[PDB]
Amino acid sequence: DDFAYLNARVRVRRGTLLKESFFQEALDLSFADFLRLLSETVYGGELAGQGLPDVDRAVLRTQAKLVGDLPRLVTGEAREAVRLLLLRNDLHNLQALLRAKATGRPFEEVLLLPGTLREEVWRQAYEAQDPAGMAQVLAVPGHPLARALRAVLRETQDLARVEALLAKRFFEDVAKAAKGLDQPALRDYLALEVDAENLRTAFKLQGSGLAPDAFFLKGGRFVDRVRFARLMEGDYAVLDELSGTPFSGLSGVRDLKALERGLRCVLLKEAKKGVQDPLGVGLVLAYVKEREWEAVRLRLLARRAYFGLPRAQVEEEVVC
Amino acid sequence: GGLDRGLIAVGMGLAVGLAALGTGVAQARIGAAGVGAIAEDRSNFGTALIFLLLPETLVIFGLLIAFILNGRL
Amino acid sequence: GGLDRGLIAVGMGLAVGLAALGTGVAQARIGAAGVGAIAEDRSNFGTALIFLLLPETLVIFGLLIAFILNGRL
Amino acid sequence: GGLDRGLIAVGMGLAVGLAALGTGVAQARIGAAGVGAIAEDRSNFGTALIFLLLPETLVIFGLLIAFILNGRL
Amino acid sequence: SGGLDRGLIAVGMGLAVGLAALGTGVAQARIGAAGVGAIAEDRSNFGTALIFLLLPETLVIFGLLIAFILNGRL
Amino acid sequence: GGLDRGLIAVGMGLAVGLAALGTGVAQARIGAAGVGAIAEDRSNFGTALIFLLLPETLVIFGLLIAFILNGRL
Amino acid sequence: GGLDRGLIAVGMGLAVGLAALGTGVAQARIGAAGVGAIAEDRSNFGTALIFLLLPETLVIFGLLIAFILNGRL
Amino acid sequence: GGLDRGLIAVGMGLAVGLAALGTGVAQARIGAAGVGAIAEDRSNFGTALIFLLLPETLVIFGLLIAFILNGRL
Amino acid sequence: GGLDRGLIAVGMGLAVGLAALGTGVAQARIGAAGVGAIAEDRSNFGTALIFLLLPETLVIFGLLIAFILNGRL
Amino acid sequence: GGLDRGLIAVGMGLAVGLAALGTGVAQARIGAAGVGAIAEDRSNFGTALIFLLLPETLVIFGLLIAFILNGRL
Amino acid sequence: GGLDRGLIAVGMGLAVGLAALGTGVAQARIGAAGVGAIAEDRSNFGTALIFLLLPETLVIFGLLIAFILNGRL
Amino acid sequence: GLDRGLIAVGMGLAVGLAALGTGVAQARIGAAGVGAIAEDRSNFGTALIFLLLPETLVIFGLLIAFILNGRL
Amino acid sequence: GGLDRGLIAVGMGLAVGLAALGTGVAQARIGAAGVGAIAEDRSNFGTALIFLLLPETLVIFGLLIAFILNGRL
Amino acid sequence: VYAFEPVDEHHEADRIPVVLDNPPWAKPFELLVSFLNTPKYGTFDPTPVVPVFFPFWFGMIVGDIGYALLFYLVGRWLSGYVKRNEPLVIDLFALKLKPQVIGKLVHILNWMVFWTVVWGVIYGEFFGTFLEHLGVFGTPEHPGLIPILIHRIDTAKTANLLILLSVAFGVVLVFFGLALRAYLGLKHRHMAHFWEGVGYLGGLVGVLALAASYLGNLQAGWLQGLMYLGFGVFLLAVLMSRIWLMIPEIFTQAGHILSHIRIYAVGAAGGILAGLLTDVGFALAERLGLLGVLLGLLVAGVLHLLILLLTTLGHMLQPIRLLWVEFFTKFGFYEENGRPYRPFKSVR
């Protein structure tokens, strides 16, 4: 419930970061200068050994230390908004456990990096005979995945169309919980996330020719279902119809890479605008989005320094 | 002083209590925001304490009105 | 006098105290948002100071009303 | 007066104080949104100033009622 | 010229005017916050936001009319 | 007469004032959600204005009781 | 037969005003959630209007108490 | 007599208005969550309406006390 | 006769109104969280109705005190 | 007794009503958290029931104070 | 002479009622945080119950003041 | 015969609203302290000192009640 | 005639109670932010306690004005 | 070749580092000034005026002889710990501190306890109120010995004089701060800051004259032209600024000057609280029984020690808080914080 007591530590973590000058100096680096600059950074608190996987685990531990306490330090409404912020790794581990159950891979075969649930709940739900029983063994009190997998669990046990319907139920429950609270800043970002998810599904599925209304979800405002059908057809004109919306520079780009980069830059500019509500959760969302953008850019830059990639090779990823 | 002295003290006291209530009402959000800003860094505390101490003129006017009510009696 | 002076002091104290309460109620969110802005960037200190000082006009009007009540009593 | 004038002045003071309380209750969220928009861009300075000045109509109505009550004191 | 009614009528008119002002400001707080967010989003719907802000003044106008009637039939 | 007319006017004023306070209390969150839906799209002017104008019934009943008290006055 | 009709009018005014205050207190969150459902679904306007009208039972009981007080005096 | 009779109606008003205030305070968040559940699915409308109508027991007890006061006077 | 009848009625009205206000204050968050948990599933609906009806004991104690006051009157 | 019996009834009613208001204020967030814990699991039913019923000690002390006041009345 | 023992009883009742209101206001957040901690870990029931029951000293001081008023009367 | 009961009424209002303000502080204080205690048991003493910091208003209210009892 | 000392002490009690209410209202957010800061790091608990103790000037001025009232009593 | 030039002048000495230049008596005030940032290298360090004023204000605030005796006893205990010469390590506080910091704290405690005992004698307060039993001070109600300067239970003669002295100290501090701001604007050739300080001084003089004339006594003839010239000087330097530094800044400076009465309020409140505690303890101990006086005196001393641990730290801090709020901000002290003297350590 404390939107300011956790925000004090959030501003403390946002004050401690490696700036863009640390990357512009590392723009000419060959993973030794980059290993020192990451060893000098906050990732140097987790810089154990050497290599691309060691820097990967160091950046993962640095992000899980700087942002992983946001699931803690709040109770009630602020804890609910924080749990419905970093739903990427939790739903990733949930889909990975579903893949290991429905495919036959071992639970120790899955890595299952840190989302929002502990390792014990995921180990209890990985060996589970029933899908409702697995969603109840993984039922956290603030888990909307517990309210989505159990809702879509009256289709099958572990299937593919059931998994797509459960992901649609997770996105719909996320948007419904975003509308279901006093979220003037958070429901906008959640609806932008759902609409950009549908738009990126249409952009990567450009040329699929499938049913757009079956692919279109409910909650979006940046486009319409007719624009969704025009984008399901091989036409970036509906993608060029995004003018005045948060997709400012996104027009006439039909490639999945260009459209996904435009959606990512628009979402970065949108979540960066959360600083108008600093005593709520928009400052913490802006700090989490900036840490995520800088950490993914640092992962791309660590790979670029370990591979000796050019400045023109990291140019489209050094924009955000 | 009859109805003057008994009720004038009550009129000063309601003013002082409501002025302190409004001062603490400002001071809650001001101190929470200043504590968050000082927890961000211990370098911009000069403006933080300035914004914290800026909410005092209401209590100052209440105490001045209390002094004026004491002098008028 | 008597009941006139006591009720006049009661009404003036109620006016001044509730004006101070409203000014502090405004200044709470005003100073909170200004401290958040200065934590974002201290380069907007003048406009934030003007936004913080904007809640004092009601306090000045209440002080003028209290002065009118003291002149009438 | 001694009985009617005190009650009339107490009602006028309660009117002015509650008007200032409501104006501050508006001005809290008004200054919060204005500081957020000014931290966004300084181009909306006149619009935020107009939005802050919009909250004074009830205080002006209370001031006109207080002038009429001083004329009818 | 009542001994106590002439002050109590004006006191009730002042209570009405102050509570109407408080309710109008309480509505105008959320109204102006939402209008400021919408205007910072786009400065094109300023007329609709101005109409939505001016919609909350009807209670203040009714309280002012009641205060005028109470000052008239005092 | 005596003090009954002013007390009835005080009761009518309290009725009208707190009824307007309740109408504005409803209208705050109602118009907040309506202005949010207007910021979503301009295709809800025939419904957001309806949801705004739905809450005037309590103010109308309070004004009717105030007119009944003024007829009693 | 002193201040009995005026005090009864004061009590009826307090009842009507605070009952409309509670009705608007319900209708704030009721109309906010109903406008959220209506912007979510334009076919969900009937149940939203039903939930908006569901809170006027206290206003109806207050008007009935006002008529009972008008009959009692 | 002419003093005890108006105070009984004042107490009836203090019962009725504050009881409807508490009833609407209960109805606000309950109707908000119920409208959210109805926008989620229009299949739990029975239990939602049951929870919406369940909170009138305090209003029923207050109306029983008001009817007892009306029978007393 | 005596104004203690009206005074006891004023105190009983304050008791009933504040008891219904506290019961509604509990029932707001109680019904909101219960409507959320029932929109989740009706599997714990019996304990949910028990937790919803748990807030009537304050109204029961207030009605016991009001019955003691009515029997003493 | 005279008028002091109604005054003692007024004081006991204000005590019992404010005790019930504080008990419901305690019960609101406690019942919301208990409903969340019951929607989480059923093994914490008795602990949440004990935490919800812990707020009745203030109501018991207020009932004892009202019984002592009635013994004084 | 009357209206002094009843006045002291009304003051002691107001003390006990608002002290129970403050105790319940602390106990709301105390019980909500304790329910969250016990749902997180039921082994931490003792320190959470201690932090919840720490807010009873205000009600204890109010009961001591009520006993002092009973001894004085 | 009227300056002996209204003094006690004002002292009761003082003690009650002082306990109300102390409970208003202690609500957020105990919420944050219980959150920190559920976070870690090693932060008990600082939260205890922070909770005990709010007792000055209750001490001042008890002193005002004792002074009003000495006056009345 | 002997109703001035009791009324002055009633107003001083209202002053002290509302001043302590405003002080605790400031101290709620102040101590919550200080606890949320000092639990993160045990290196700024002193600067947090500085802001926690900065708000006692209102209680000190209220006690000073109450002593001025007792001296005028 | 060591080109040993001086630093740059008051126009932009920002990369130039800063360091304190205080006396050996004024050396311990640098530890309290270290809570503030470094100076603008041409900005006057008011840390000696801080040790002059906050010790005097803390003395006028803390006037309990039992509290000053506890302060001297804790200074003796800390001096024994510094004779043990370990770093002051409170694992409860989780702070291991330098013993030089402990010695500076002990020296500041002695320099403050001198004025504390002085004003406690001026208050006539011995371990709280020992004059109830043995009147070592002289009151007209209970003459046991020679008189005390402050009655501390009687205030009708003391309220006006205490308020006037608390106003006068803050007014002299505000005048010194405005004069320092104008002198710094002159020395740095910052005519904006000089004209701002001049207009602040003129408006403050006119406002003080108008307040004392209209709100105080009669005979506003000597103050009419005073308020007129002060308002004219304020408007003239406002035109010499033309920056819309409005009446809010002048009212902020006025409230900062007026905030010095809270020190007298807090000192009187602490004295009245200690006197009420000691009087209730002596009453319920000796006046109720005269044989359970030891146990009742122990309970009263424990309650007084708990109240001291609850309130005296804030009472000592709020004078320093108001001093840092007034004297620093009157001289600015939030202008780029200069640069720090950061040489090579060679810690050894």
Short mmCIF file of C-alpha atoms in Angstrom, two decimals, chain L residues 19-57:
data_model
loop_
_atom_site.label_atom_id
_atom_site.label_comp_id
_atom_site.label_asym_id
_atom_site.label_seq_id
_atom_site.Cartn_x
_atom_site.Cartn_y
_atom_site.Cartn_z
CA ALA L 19 -5.49 9.70 21.02
CA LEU L 20 -7.08 9.99 17.56
CA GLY L 21 -4.02 11.79 16.17
CA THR L 22 -1.65 9.36 17.90
CA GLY L 23 -3.56 6.43 16.41
CA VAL L 24 -3.51 8.14 13.01
CA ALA L 25 0.28 8.30 13.25
CA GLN L 26 0.56 4.80 14.71
CA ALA L 27 -1.52 3.25 11.90
CA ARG L 28 1.06 4.05 9.21
CA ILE L 29 3.87 3.58 11.75
CA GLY L 30 2.75 0.08 12.73
CA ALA L 31 1.96 -0.83 9.12
CA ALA L 32 5.49 0.07 8.02
CA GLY L 33 6.96 -1.60 11.11
CA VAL L 34 5.03 -4.82 10.55
CA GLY L 35 6.11 -4.80 6.91
CA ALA L 36 9.73 -4.40 7.98
CA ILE L 37 9.35 -7.12 10.63
CA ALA L 38 7.86 -9.50 8.07
CA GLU L 39 10.78 -8.51 5.84
CA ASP L 40 13.33 -9.27 8.57
CA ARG L 41 13.31 -9.92 12.30
CA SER L 42 16.63 -8.07 12.67
CA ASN L 43 15.03 -4.61 12.27
CA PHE L 44 12.92 -4.77 15.44
CA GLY L 45 14.63 -2.17 17.62
CA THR L 46 14.62 0.71 15.13
CA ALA L 47 10.93 0.15 14.36
CA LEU L 48 10.25 -0.05 18.10
CA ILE L 49 12.00 3.29 18.65
CA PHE L 50 10.07 4.79 15.73
CA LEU L 51 6.80 3.54 17.23
CA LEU L 52 7.77 4.83 20.68
CA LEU L 53 8.52 8.26 19.15
CA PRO L 54 4.75 8.87 18.80
CA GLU L 55 4.13 8.79 22.57
CA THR L 56 4.97 12.49 23.13
CA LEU L 57 1.49 13.60 22.03
#
